[PDB]
C-alpha cells in the first residue's frame, strides 16, 4: 500500500548570499555543507518515515540575493516562494532555502503545511546552523511540507507524548540536545496525509542526482543497469538479480514493485491501488522495473458524494476542513447554520472581516463564508485562535466556529476555496462562483461536453487514463487483447 512503499523527496536547495559568506565565499564548501545536511536529514527520514530525501538540484547566490531576506521567516518564505514560482525552473518535489541569516522568531525555519508537490507551496526556508542542528531544522521543515504537524489538541490532552524526555522529538522546540525521532502521532499524520491523496509526486525514484554514482546507493543512474543498494539488505530482494551493480546472466531487474523474481511482472498487474476517490489505480507496463508514477484525477472531479472536489488528488469538503482544523470528532454543521447565520450576523456568521459592516452574505449560497462546525473543542489541531470561539444555538443544533490562522495570511476559519457550494458550483474568495471561473483544463474528448470520449478519466497530467481495453488516445477505439 501507500505506507510500505518508499517515498522519494527530490529536494532542491538554494543557498543565499549570506550562506555563501558563512562558508568563506566558496561554492564548493557551501555545496558540501548542504550535501552533508541533506544526507543527515535523509538518515533521519529513512529510518522512521520510510522516505528518502534526495538532493537533485542546487544553486548558490554567489553574487547577491535575488530578493530581500527578512528576519521574519514567514515573509522570507513568501518572498522565496514567489521567486521560485517566477525564476526557479528545476523540477523538484520541494525547494528549500538555506539562509545564512538568523530569524528573529521562535522557529528556525518556516514551511507550508502539506504543500509538497506544489509550485506555489512546495518549499520552505531554513536558517544557518551546525550541520546536525540544521539537518534537524530541514527535517522538520520537510515534515511540515509532507503534512506532519504538532497536534496541539492531542498534546494538551496527552493522547500521545514524545518517548524521549531528554532530547525531545523533532517537532518540538530544539535545544542543545538535538532530537532524533518522530512521535507516533507524527507517523500517523504522515500516513493520513498519504492516504488522503497528498504527496503523489513522491512515488518516482530519482534517476539523476548531484552525487557521482556509487555501487550500492540504490538509484539506477547512467551506465548502471541494476542497483539493489547495500548488499546487507540486497539479500532480502534482488540478491539473485543484481550482483556488484551488474546483471546475473538471465535477469530483467534488480528490485521494484512491478518486477518479481528477476522477471518483468506481466502487464496489467496492480502495483498501487487507489488510496481514495480521487486516486487512479496504477498498472504495471510489463517492461519497467518500477511502478508507474502516482497519477490521480484532475482538479475538478467529484469525490466522496457531491460534497467535494479533487484538488491535487485530495478531497476538499467542509467536513474535512472542520476535522483538519479542530479534530476527528468534529463534523460540519448543518446547512441550517449557514443559511440562518451567514445572512445576518456579527462575529457569528459572515463572509469577511471588514471592520465597517463585516459582510452581509447574499442568500445565493452562504456556504462560502464562516466555517461553522459541530462539537468544536477549546483548542484547534493547529494554528492560533485570532479571537474567541463562536458559540451559537424544530431542531436544536450546536453551532460553533473560529478564526484560526496559519503560516500565511489565509484565515482557516473561513471555507477553503474550491469547496462545493452547489451542483456544478464551487466557492472562490468568499463568493460562490461557477466552475468556469476556476479555468480547469480538460483532456481530449470526441463527444460534446464529455471526458475522454465519455469512457475515460482525465488524470492530473492531462492525459486520458483510458478504460479497460481502450488503447485509443482519446479512449475511442476498443481493442480486444489479453
Amino acid at each position: 500500500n501507500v505506507e510500505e512503499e518508499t517515498k522519494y523527496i527530490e529536494l532542491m536547495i538554494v543557498n543565499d548570499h549570506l550562506m555563501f559568506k558563512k562558508h568563506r565565499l566558496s561554492v564548493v564548501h557551501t555545496n558540501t555543507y548542504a550535501k552533508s545536511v541533506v544526507n543527515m536529514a535523509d538518515l533521519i527520514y529513512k529510518d522512521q518515515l520510510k522516505t528518502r530525501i534526495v538532493l537533485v538540484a542546487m544553486e548558490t547566490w554567489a553574487t547577491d540575493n535575488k530578493f530581500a531576506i527578512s528576519e521574519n521567516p514567514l515573509i522570507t518564505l513568501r518572498e522565496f516562494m514567489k521567486y521560485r514560482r517566477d525564476f526557479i525552473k528545476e523540477k523538484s518535489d520541494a525547494v528549500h532555502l538555506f539562509s545564512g541569516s538568523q530569524f528573529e522568531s521562535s522557529r528556525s525555519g518556516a514551511a507550508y503545511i502539506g504543500g509538497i508537490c506544489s509550485l506555489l507551496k512546495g518549499g520552505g526556508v531554513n536558517e544557518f546552523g551546525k550541520t546536525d542542528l540544521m539537518a534537524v531544522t530541514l527535517a522538520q521543515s520537510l515534515a511540515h511540507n509532507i503534512g506532519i504537524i504538532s497536534d496541539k489538541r492531542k498534546l494538551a490532552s496527552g493522547e500521545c507524548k514524545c518517548e524521549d524526555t531528554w532530547s525531545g522529538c523533532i517537532m518540538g522546540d530544539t535545544g542543545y540536545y538535538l532530537p532524533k525521532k518522530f512521535t507516533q502521532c507524527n507517523i500517523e499524520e504522515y500516513h493520513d496525509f498519504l492516504n488522503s491523496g497528498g504527496g503523489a509526486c513522491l512515488f518516482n525514484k530519482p534517476s539523476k542526482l548531484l552525487d557521482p554514482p556509487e555501487c550500492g546507493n540504490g538509484f539506477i543512474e547512467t551506465g548502471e543497469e541494476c542497483d539493489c543498494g547495500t548488499p546487507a539488505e540486497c539479500v532480502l530482494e534482488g540478491a539473485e538479480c543484481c550482483k556488484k551493480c551488474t546483471l546475473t546472466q538471465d535477469s530483467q531487474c534488480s528490485d521494484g514493485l512491478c518486477c518479481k523474481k528477476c522477471k518483468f511482472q506481466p502487464m496489467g498487474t496492480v502495483c498501487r491501488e487507489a488510496v481514495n476517490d480521487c486516486d487512479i489505480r496504477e498498472t504495471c507496463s510489463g517492461n519497467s522495473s518500477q511502478c508507474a508514477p502516482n497519477i490521480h484525477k484532475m482538479d475538478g472531479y467529484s469525490c466522496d458524494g457531491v460534497q467535494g472536489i479533487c484538488f491535487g488528488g485530495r478531497c476538499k469538503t467542509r467536513d474535512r476542513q472542520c476535522k483538519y482544523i479542530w479534530g476527528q470528532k468534529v463534523t460540519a454543521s448543518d446547512k441550517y447554520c449557514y443559511e440562518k447565520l451567514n445572512i445576518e450576523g456579527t462575529e457569528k456568521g459572515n463572509c469577511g472581516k471588514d471592520k465597517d459592516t463585516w459582510i452581509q452574505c447574499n442568500k445565493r449560497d452562504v456556504l462560502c463564508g464562516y466555517l461553522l462546525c459541530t462539537n468544536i473543542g477549546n483548542i484547534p489541531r493547529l494554528g492560533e485562535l485570532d479571537g474567541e470561539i463562536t458559540s451559537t444555538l424544530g431542531r436544536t443544533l450546536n453551532c460553533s466556529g473560529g478564526h484560526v490562522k496559519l503560516e500565511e495570511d489565509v484565515d482557516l476559519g473561513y471555507v477553503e476555496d474550491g469547496t462545493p457550494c452547489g451542483p456544478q458550483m464551487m466557492c472562490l474568495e468568499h463568493r460562490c462562483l461557477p466552475v468556469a471561473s476556476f479555468n480547469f483544463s480538460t483532456c481530449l474528448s470526441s463527444k460534446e461536453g464529455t471526458i475522454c470520449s465519455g469512457n475515460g478519466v482525465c488524470s492530473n497530467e492531462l492525459k486520458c487514463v483510458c478504460n479497460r481495453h481502450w488503447i485509443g488516445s482519446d479512449c475511442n477505439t476498443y481493442f480486444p487483447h489479453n
Binding site: 538568523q102 551546525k130 542542528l133 531528554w166 522546540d173 530544539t174 535545544g175 542543545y176 540536545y177
Partner: protein, 330 residues
C-alpha cells in the same frame, strides 16, 4: 616531592554537573544525574573516609542542580529539560528539600547552564537557554524568592554563561561582567550598569567562533579565560584592559569542558576529551603558560570540580557515558 591526581572512588552513575557548597560548617557535593532525573547530594563520611549519599531531589531530566546559600539557608536551582525548572529550599527541621518556587516553562525551556553571583549584597543566578524561543534570563533574590530581572540574548541558542569581574582600564576598580556562549556565534561580553542595575554594552570576542563555554581564572591579579571548542583549538586569553588577547591554543578532540582549578595555590587546567585522554595542565609561572601535567582516563567528561575536606583535596570528574570519578591530589 611532586604532586599528582590519584583515583579514589568510582560512583556507578553518569552525571553532567557537580557542585560543592558549605552548609552549617560542612562541605557537600551535588551531582546532577541526567538519565534518572536526580540531584544526588553527597557528604563526607568522617568515619569511613568516603562520600556518603546524603539526600536526593527527584526530577525528570535534570541538567543542573545549582546550590545557593543565602544567609545560612540552602536553596537549590534545578534545571530540567522536561517538566520545567524548580527551586527547592532545604528545611533543616525535617531534614528534607521542599519545593518553594516554579520557573515558568515559557521563559526557561531548554536550560544548559546556571551561574550564581552576588552584586552589592544581592543574589542573582543566570540560566543559559539553548532554545531560540527561550531567552537567557537573570533572576534576583528579593528575600523570599527568585524573580525575573533581565533577559539578555534573544533568539540565540546559548550554551554557557560565565560571571567574572575584570578591571576595564579607564578605571581602577573591578566591575561585574557576564560572558555568554551560543551556538555558531562568537562569545558575548556584558558589562554591569550600576545606575540602571542591568547588564549592558553587548560586545563580541573576536576571532573565536562557536565557543561552547568560557571559564575564567586569576594569576597574580591578571584575569584569564579558558575558551572551550569541541573540535579544533581551545584557547587561553588574557584581559588586556579593554579586550582579550590570545595566550596559547590547545588541541581539542571532543572537548566539552576546559576547567581552570586552583588547588593549594597551584593553578591547574583540565581539558576534557570525548575521543581521547583528558589532559591536566599546570600553570608555568615563569613562562606564563600552561604546561602538560597528567592524563586522566574519564569517559566523556562534562565537568571538573575541586573539593577541599579538612586539608584533603578531591577532584570530582563527571562522566556522561560511564562512571563519575573522584580523584585525590597527592
Amino acid at each position: 616531592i611532586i604532586t599528582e591526581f590519584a583515583k579514589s572512588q568510582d560512583l556507578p552513575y553518569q552525571s553532567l554537573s557537580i557542585d560543592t557548597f558549605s552548609y552549617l560548617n560542612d562541605e557537600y557535593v551535588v551531582i546532577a544525574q541526567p538519565f534518572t532525573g536526580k540531584c544526588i547530594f553527597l557528604e563526607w563520611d568522617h568515619v569511613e573516609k568516603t562520600f556518603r549519599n546524603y539526600d536526593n531531589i527527584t526530577g525528570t531530566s535534570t541538567v543542573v542542580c545549582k546550590p545557593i546559600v543565602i544567609e545560612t539557608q540552602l536553596y537549590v536551582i534545578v534545571a530540567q529539560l522536561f517538566g520545567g525548572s524548580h527551586i527547592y529550599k532545604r528545611d533543616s527541621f525535617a531534614n528534607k528539600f521542599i519545593k518553594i518556587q516554579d520557573i515558568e516553562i515559557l521563559k526557561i525551556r531548554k536550560p544548559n547552564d546556571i551561574e550564581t553571583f552576588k552584586i552589592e549584597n544581592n543574589w542573582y543566578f543566570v540560566v543559559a537557554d539553548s532554545s531560540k524561543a527561550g531567552f537567557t534570563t537573570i533572576y534576583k533574590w528579593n528575600g523570599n524568592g527568585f524573580y525575573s530581572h533581565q533577559s539578555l540574548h534573544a533568539w540565540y541558542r546559548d550554551t554557557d554563561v560565565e560571571y567574572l569581574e575584570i578591571v576595564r582600564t579607564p578605571q581602577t576598580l573591578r566591575t561585574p561582567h557576564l560572558i555568554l556562549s551560543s551556538s555558531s556565534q562568537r562569545p558575548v561580553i556584558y558589562q554591569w550598569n550600576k545606575a540602571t542595575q542591568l547588564f549592558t554594552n553587548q560586545t563580541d570576542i573576536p576571532n573565536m567562533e562557536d565557543v561552547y563555554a568560557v571559564k575564567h581564572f586569576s594569576v597574580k591579579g591578571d584575569v584569564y579565560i579558558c575558551l572551550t571548542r569541541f573540535i579544533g583549538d581551545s584557547k587561553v586569553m588574557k584581559w588586556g584592559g579593554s579586550s582579550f588577547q590570545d595566550i596559547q591554543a590547545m588541541p581539542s578532540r571532543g572537548s566539552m569542558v576546559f576547567q581552570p582549578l586552583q588547588i593549594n595555590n597551584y593553578q591547574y587546567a583540565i581539558l576534557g576529551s570525548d575521543y581521547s585522554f583528558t589532559q591536566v595542565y599546570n600553570w608555568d609561572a615563569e613562562k606564563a603558560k600552561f604546561v602538560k601535567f597528567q592524563e586522566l582516563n574519564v569517559q566523556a567528561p562534562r565537568s571538573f570540580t575541586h573539593v577541599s575536606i579538612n586539608k584533603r583535596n578531591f577532584l570530582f570528574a563527571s562522566s556522561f557515558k560511564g562512571n563519575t570519578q573522584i580523584y585525590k591530589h597527592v
